[PDB]
From a paper:
Pol μ is capable of performing gap-filling repair synthesis in the nonhomologous end joining (NHEJ) pathway. Compared with replicative DNA polymerase, Pol μ lacks proofreading activity, with an intrinsically high error rate of 10−3–10−5 for dNTP incorporation. Here, crystal structures and kinetics of Pol μ substituting dGTP for dATP on gapped DNA substrates containing templating T were determined and compared.
To further investigate the possible roles of these two residues in dGTP misincorporation, crystal structures of Q441A single-mutant and Q441A/K438A double-mutant proteins complexed with 1-nt gapped DNA and dGMPNPP were determined (Complexes 4 and 5, respectively). In contrast to the stable templating T observed in all the WT:DNA structures (binary complex and Complexes 1-3), the electron density clearly shows an alternative conformation of the templating T and −1 base in the structure of Complex 4. The second conformation of templating T rolls toward the major groove but maintains its interactions with surrounding Arg residues. On the other side, the dGMPNPP and 3ʹ-end dA of the primer strand adopt a single conformation, which is very similar to the flipped conformation (conformation B) observed in Complexes 2 and 3. The N7 of guanine base of dGMPNPP interacts with Lys438, which forms a distorted WC-like pair with the templating T. Compared with WT:DNA structures (Complexes 2 and 3), structures in which alanine was substituted for Gln441 (Complexes 4 and 5) exhibit a much more stable dGMPNPP, indicating that Gln441 may play a role in discrimination against dGTP misincorporation over the templating T on a 1-nt gapped DNA substrate. This result is consistent with the increased Km for the correct insertion of dATP but a decreased Km for dGTP misincorporation of Q441A single-mutant and K438A/Q441A double-mutant proteins. In contrast, dGMPNPP is stable when Gln441 is replaced with Ala, leading to the destabilized templating strand (Complexes 4 and 5). Given that Q411A vs. WT exhibited both increased dGTP binding affinity and the elevated relative misincorporation rate on a 1-nt gapped DNA, Gln441 may function as the fidelity checkpoint in the minor groove by stabilizing the templating base.
Author numbering: 138 to 366, 383 to 397, 410 to 494
Amino acid sequence: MPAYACQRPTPLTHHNTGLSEALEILAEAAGFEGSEGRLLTFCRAASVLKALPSPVTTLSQLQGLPHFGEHSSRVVQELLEHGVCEEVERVRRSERYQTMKLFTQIFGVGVKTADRWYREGLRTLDDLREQPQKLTQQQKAGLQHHQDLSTPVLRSDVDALQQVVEEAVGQALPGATVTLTGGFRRGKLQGHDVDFLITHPKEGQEAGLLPRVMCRLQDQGLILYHQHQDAFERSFCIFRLPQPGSWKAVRVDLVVAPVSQFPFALLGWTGSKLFARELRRFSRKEKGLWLNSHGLFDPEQKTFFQAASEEDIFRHLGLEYLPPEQRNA
DNA sequence: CGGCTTACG
DNA sequence: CGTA
DNA sequence: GCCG
Ligand SMILES: Nc1nc2c(ncn2[C@H]2C[C@H](O)[C@@H](COP(=O)(O)NP(=O)(O)OP(=O)(O)O)O2)c(=O)[nH]1
Ligand SMILES: [Mg+2]
Ligand SMILES: [Mg+2]
Ligand SMILES: [Mg+2]
């Protein structure tokens, strides 16, 4: 079992679901307290279990596994012996964890903002609604749409959304393409949003595209919120999506990349977020190359690797290729 | 011990 | 600060 | 919290 998540296949569904879910609670709680190192270790340990070929049934099976030390092994031991880990349960029911989870789930609210509100005594969404002077326009939109945004997006929703985005993209720039990325590209059957990557086969033609796309979507009445309701290339918006007799708000992410960068953007925005983070860490620490969603840089030669495909990038990094369905770290 | 992310909005 |  |  290699130490980096990008060195092993991680399928969407696996054989250690309960154990990984417990470790991810602790990871989440570490992030609520600002402990990014502990968050990473618990995230990485959970990911190791997702990559295992069978269930962990005894402690000895944790021997030699990367990112399992005293703390994560004790968590697994208690789940194996009693079905529950007291630390995890204490976190689950704590007022701090529940409120930080509630607040950070709001679109436009991160850990710093949620922590400030918590310290001021706020605890519920209605607490926030009563203090609208505390809220950015983005957070007001996240708060008003919170109930719809907490409803999982379904794979059936995704196809209708992609068609309306493609229609607006095609008017904005004939020949531009829309590629589904994020969790649905990794095979997820539901998600918190829908992620699209847009490009054009003629390098440079994608410049200035996303303002034109957003203006067309907004004119069609499909945009409930976006940051530009000047030049921009990413939009994190809220879409109006049809439903039986009505509609629901859905988060949609749109990203534009030139075709030269498209493989790097596709790799970055397909995720998972831990997979991509580990891939960039592997690139820097093990290969001495700087990877991001725009390219792959050799700091010694001061040169960028050209890539025509994700397969190119895995090869540049000396990694076996993983299809998106195996990037569910 | 140092290290653990990234550009863009 | 937020996207996260 | 764990790795190197
Ligand atoms: N660097 C970084 N990139 C991130 C982060 N979160 C997301 N991204 C970028 C990089 C990710 O690869 C990309 C897509 O992640 P989502 O759409 O946020 N989530 P997914 O589709 O996996 O699932 P679902 O939507 O169902 O929750 O967004 C983060 O914390 N950090
Ligand atoms: Mg997504
Ligand atoms: Mg997204
Ligand atoms: Mg230390």
